[PDB]
Design a protein around this ligand. Structure first.
Ligand code: 4C8
Length: 1182
């Protein structure tokens, strides 16, 4: 919404930039006017053949005389028009270079200025300015918004004025050469602007419907793929597939309905657009039979008006480009023009010499740019004598640090003054102020250069002698000499990451070259290892005694040797003096001392598409028809002008033009009959394979074992995204692009035969001409993208040192040296600048030479056309036919290069979608093999089980584990921490097979058992029960699949789980919907339902994985009261973290390091005094 004044945006154009834009936009208007003149001459060449085509047919008496006066008219006329044509092509050769080169010159020159000025302004902002903005957004604003300005002040403006020139020049030649046809072509323009306006309404309303259609199927997939371990546990893998398949049937029906309506929209749109042209050209013939216009003039205005009418649309993007460039220049010029109060670039203020360093803070009230919400200093008083070292202490608030901020004049105080020596800090130059103040902060930062360069950021003029003395005087010399490369080592966020106390000493040496008169030490010793602390503290004490120092820390070890100590309480200075005196004061200071003591040939995706052997052949056949049917419209146009230039007797003409105009309206309805079929057939054929793909993909996804969904590469979001993209892309590869790529090769294929057989070698010329200008247009775009990628590579090096500059900026401004980054960034930009000058000459040459090859080509179209072919018996009516046939057959192949990324984008989406079907798991739930034993009672054997999770094969969770539980017994399971408690349940569910050892149930190894049958006698109940969006009756009936569960049977389970209080209390009862979509209810109810569905199954084994994890108050008392009833009649394994409820367990087992450590009944393990005795004592006391 905000924009910029049109002059202020070009504020950096002067002298030459103003001239380049003028000569550029001048030649840009010359370039535009050339094309309607190029069509003006096309009309005069018609009358030349027309004055001869009418007299050649008017004879029927003399033949050698028609070889004289006729051919003489031609060679004087044709060579006159051919001379003009070659001149127009030489004209656009020059002006197109002048056009694009100059504007890209003016843009390149300005954008170089924008950048330097804009980064300059970023570094000139006071710290209170950054405290309210994001440096991340600002940096991205620096590289993106400057790019948008370049796009709007570049060759796009020259293009804008080229288009308006064709618009004006088109309707000038339109109006002047005839005021009737123009008003007629403008009358059908509302119809053309109304037919394309139906597409802005159908697309935007149906692209939502499809995004609302699959959103109903993707919602099923997401609660499934998020609750996958619950559907795997209960084996709903057939239902959740079926339910996803039931939503795929509706999206197919809504996709075929969209395919019906959208293809009706295109065909009727073209047929209205092509009828609107017909009537404008038929009614152009109706005015030549009346002898008002010539057959040549009808062509001139008809083209010049349509050319001029369509230049309106070819300019609208450049308007938007210039407009986006204005609005983007707002927030950028806003920074450049914003003048600060502090500067730090200002060359003003006093530079006191012989600074003794007597500092005082008087009545300083202050607040950070959070402003009225918080006031951190409620007045202040604090001197510090020269040479002394004051120490600031405080419990919280850190108004301690605030005095360091103010002393650097980072912010000015709200009320009061900070006085270095006798002068207010605000009289002294801000730069000289920060040069006479060294700073050592809590987090040290070193810039991505050498040690000598980081030390050189203290002073730019320095010799390794003084670097050596500085690092040696901050005892930081002994420890870099051992480090290789000596002073030439690297530092940064990338490479050679050093110790904290090591990084601080380089900062002290950096501040030591500064030889400052003032010293500010904020938190420098805090947050650092204890041993290297003393090494740095030795340097801090050696960095003082020659200076006056204010120090802030929480280490009460560095404060004793301070001459004076200051304490705060609510921003108020409260307690000051020497160490011994504050201890006698027994106040705030004393109170704190005691406290601290792969692209490839994928044929099979088409082989799966071969499920529909028809539907394609219906479309292909129907597309080649429409392909062959499309040059015939040019053949009709050739003969509507042909027989009416080759007329002779004018009486038979009016009756044939009526017959031709009737044919084309029959030929367009049969084109709309054949266009609708080629779209509907692929539309239906593409939507039905989208079901087959998404069906087969979602199937093989439920096939994979838990080992695959734990992969951080495959999350629930990344799987539905992989589910929707890969199936939509392959539809596009086999969809519209294929119908169009076969329509167009039939378009040229049928047009190449018609033209070839009329004009002998006439067509053989254009086939030496057209493929060259098409290749020349493609190599231009390859050079376009090459210059684009190369410039991105070398401006990000500039923005990389800008990134380092602006998000490490509160440090650099403390060090001054903004002029450093100022110059580095300037040297960084000098390469893309001198590059952008070549870009102007490159773009200008390529564009001018793809434009010249269009007019020189069309100069050669009439070079054969006349002279060598017209001195022969071959006719004019065929030269017009070959021009329209070949050039339009060529521009139809120009659609092949546009649909190229649609093929590759799908093959890569196909690359992943064929792999995801064929990938087989270690533990496939689908295998029907397995024992399916007959005996009911259930035991459980773990025997020497070692197992690590495949995601993290580092820390073992189970190693040498061995358990056993009898039927009807409760096996408690206590663990120090981790999933060692929980991994047991996962292995009994055979989520994974163990690495070593084995797990048995009824005496049989589950690893040889049926995977699905095993999970069928297991009553899993987790700590967060997930319930799908459907009836609670179904959430409860979900526990027993392969059979619909009776109402009174899911009632009996709801009776067991003690959830039946709600299940009658709700208005819908069992038919109520849960899933945070229909109704919401707390976890205690969610949980009981999970218990309900757990024992619908009537398992022989319950599995209670910390079932009282997230639960409170009476809700825990009622859930355990249900769990305790659900067991005792079944084999039970409970790992619940409530050891109170675990007392009445038939066997408790303590897990230690994966090994079983301590087992026995409660009082047994309680008689022993060890881990279980401590596990129970720690929770009972606390
Ligand atoms: Br009759 C008649 C035939 C083609 C005409 O222009 C064309 C041409 Br030329 C090519 C195609 Br494809 C469609 C149309 Br509409 C006109 Br205007 C009138």
């Amino acid at each position: 919404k905000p924009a910029v004044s049109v002059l202020t945006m070009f504020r950096y154009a002067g002298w030459l930039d103003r001239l380049y834009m003028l000569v550029g936009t001048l030649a840009a208007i010359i370039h535009g006017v050339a094309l309607p003149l190029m069509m003006l001459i096309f009309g005069d060449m018609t009358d030349s053949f027309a004055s001869v085509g009418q007299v050649s047919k008017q004879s029927t008496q003399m033949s050698e005389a028609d070889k004289r006066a006729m051919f003489a008219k031609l060679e004087e006329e044709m060579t006159t028009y051919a001379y003009y044509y070659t001149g127009i092509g030489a004209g656009v050769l020059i002006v197109a270079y002048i056009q694009v080169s100059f504007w890209c010159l003016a843009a390149g020159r300005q954008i170089h200025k924008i950048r330097q000025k804009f980064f300059h302004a970023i570094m000139n902002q006071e710290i209170g300015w950054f405290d309210v903005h994001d440096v991340g957004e600002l940096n991205t604003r620096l590289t993106d918004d400057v790019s948008k300005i370049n796009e709007g002040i570049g060759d796009k403006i020259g293009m804008f004025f080229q288009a308006m020139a064709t618009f004006f020049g088109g309707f000038i030649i339109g109006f002047t050469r005839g005021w009737k046809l123009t008003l007629v072509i403008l009358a059908i323009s509302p119809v053309l602007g109304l037919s394309a306006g139906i597409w802005a309404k159908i697309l935007s309303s149906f692209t939502d419907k499809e995004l609302h259609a699959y959103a109903k199927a993707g919602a099923v997939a997401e609660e499934v793929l998020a609750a996958i371990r619950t559907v795997i546990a209960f084996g709903g893998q057939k239902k959740e597939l079926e339910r996803y398949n039931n939503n795929l049937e509706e999206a197919k029906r809504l996709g075929i309905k969209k395919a019906i309506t959208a293809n009706i929209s295109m065909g009727a749109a073209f047929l209205l657009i092509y009828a609107s042209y017909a009537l404008a050209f038929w009614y152009g013939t109706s005015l030549v039979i009346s002898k008002e216009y010539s057959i040549g003039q009808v062509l001139t205005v008809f083209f010049s008006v349509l050319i001029g009418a369509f230049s309106v649309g070819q300019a609208s993007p450049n308007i938007e480009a210039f407009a986006n460039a204005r609005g983007a220049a707002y927030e950028v010029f806003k920074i450049i023009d914003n003048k600060p109060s502090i500067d730090s670039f200002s060359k003003s203020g006093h530079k006191p010499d012989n600074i003794q360093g007597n500092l005082e803070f008087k009545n300083i009230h202050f607040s950070y740019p959070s402003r009225k919400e918080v006031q951190i200093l409620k007045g202040l008083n604090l001197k510090v004598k020269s040479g002394q070292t004051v120490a600031l202490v405080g419990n919280s608030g850190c108004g301690k640090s605030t005095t360091v901020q103010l002393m650097q004049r980072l912010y000015d105080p709200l009320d009061g003054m900070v006085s270095i020596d006798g002068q207010d800090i605000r009289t002294i130059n801000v730069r000289y102020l920060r040069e006479i103040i060294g700073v050592v902060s809590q987090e040290p930062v070193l810039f991505a250069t050498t040690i000598a360069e980081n030390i050189r950021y203290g002073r730019e003029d320095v010799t390794m002698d003084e670097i050596e003395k500085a690092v040696k005087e901050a005892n930081a010399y002994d420890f870099i000499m051992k480090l290789p490369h000596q002073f030439d080592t690297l530092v940064g966020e990338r490479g050679a990451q050093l110790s904290g106390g090591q990084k601080q000493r380089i900062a002290i040496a950096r501040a030591l070259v500064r030889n400052p008169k003032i010293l500010l030490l904020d938190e420098a010793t805090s947050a650092l290892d204890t041993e290297s602390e003393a090494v740095v503290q030795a340097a801090l004490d050696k960095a003082r005694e020659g200076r006056t120092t204010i120090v802030i820390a929480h280490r009460l070890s560095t404060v004793r040797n301070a001459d004076v100590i200051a304490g705060f309480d609510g921003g108020v200075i409260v307690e000051q003096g020497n160490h011994d005196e504050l201890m006698r004061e027994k106040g705030i200071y004393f109170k704190l001392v005691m406290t601290q003591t792969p692209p490839a040939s994928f044929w099979r995706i088409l082989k799966l598409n071969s499920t529909e052997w028809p539907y394609f052949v219906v479309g292909i056949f129907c597309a080649i028809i429409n392909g062959g049917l499309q040059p015939a419209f040019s053949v009709i146009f050739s003969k509507v002008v042909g027989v009416f230039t080759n007329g002779g007797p004018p009486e038979t003409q009016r009756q044939n033009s009526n017959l031709f105009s009737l044919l084309f309206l029959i030929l367009g309805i049969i084109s709309f009959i054949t266009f609708f079929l080629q779209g509907f057939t692929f539309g239906k054929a593409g939507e039905i394979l989208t079901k087959r793909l998404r069906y087969m993909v979602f199937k093989s996804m439920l096939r994979q074992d838990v080992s695959w969904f734990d992969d951080p590469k495959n999350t629930t979001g990344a799987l539905t995204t992989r589910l929707a993209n890969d199936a939509a892309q392959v539809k596009g590869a086999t969809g519209s692009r294929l119908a169009v790529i076969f329509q167009n090769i039939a378009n040229l294929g049928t047009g190449i035969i018609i033209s070839l057989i009329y004009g002998w070698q006439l067509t053989l010329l254009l086939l030496a001409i057209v493929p060259i200008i098409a290749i020349a247009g493609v190599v231009e775009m390859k050079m376009l993208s090459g210059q684009a990628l190369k410039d991105k590579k070398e401006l990000e090096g500039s923005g990389k040192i800008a990134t380092e500059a602006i998000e490490n900026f509160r440090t650099v401004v403390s060090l001054t040296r903004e002029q450093k980054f100022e110059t580095m960034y300037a040297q960084s930009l000098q390469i893309p600048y001198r590059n952008a000058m070549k870009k102007a000459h490159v773009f200008g040459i390529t564009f001018s030479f793809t434009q010249a090859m269009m007019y020189f080509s069309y100069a050669a179209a009439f070079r054969f056309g006349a002279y060598l072919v017209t001195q022969q018996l071959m006719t004019f009516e065929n030269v017009l036919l070959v021009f329209s046939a070949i050039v339009f057959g060529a521009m139809a192949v120009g659609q092949v290069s546009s649909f190229a990324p649609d093929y590759a984008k799908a093959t890569v989406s196909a690359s992943h979608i064929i792999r995801i079907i064929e990938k087989t798991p270690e533990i496939d739930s689908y295998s029907t093999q397995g024992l399916k034993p007959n005996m009911l009672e259930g035991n459980v054997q773990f025997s020497g089980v070692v197992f690590n999770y495949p995601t993290r094969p580092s820390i073992p969770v189970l190693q040498g584990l061995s358990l056993e539980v009898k039927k009807g017994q409760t096996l408690a399971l206590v663990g120090s921490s981790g999933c060692g408690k929980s991994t047991v349940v996962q292995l009994l569910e055979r989520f994974y097979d163990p690495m070593a050892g084995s797990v048995f149930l009824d005496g049989k190894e589950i690893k040889q058992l049926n995977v699905q049958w095993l999970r069928a006698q297991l009553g899993i109940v987790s700590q967060e029960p997930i319930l799908f969006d459907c009836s609670i009756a179904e959430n409860i009936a979900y526990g027993d699949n392969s059979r619909v569960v009776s109402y009174e049977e899911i009632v009996r389970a709801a009776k067991e789980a003690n959830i039946h209080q709600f299940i009658d209390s709700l208005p819908d009862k069992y038919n109520t919907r849960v899933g945070d979509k229909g109704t919401q209810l707390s976890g205690g109810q969610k949980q009981r339902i999970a218990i309900a569905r757990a024992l619908v199954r009537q398992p022989h084994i319950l599995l209670l994985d910390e079932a009282t994890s997230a639960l409170d108050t009476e809700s825990e008392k009622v859930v355990q009261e249900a769990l305790d009833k659900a067991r005792e009649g079944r084999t039970c394994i409970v790992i619940a973290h409530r050891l109170s409820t675990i007392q009445n367990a038939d066997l408790i087992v303590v897990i230690q390091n994966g090994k079983v450590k301590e087992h026995g009944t409660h009082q047994q393990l309680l008689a022993q005094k060890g881990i279980y005795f401590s596990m129970v004592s720690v929770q009972a006391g606390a």
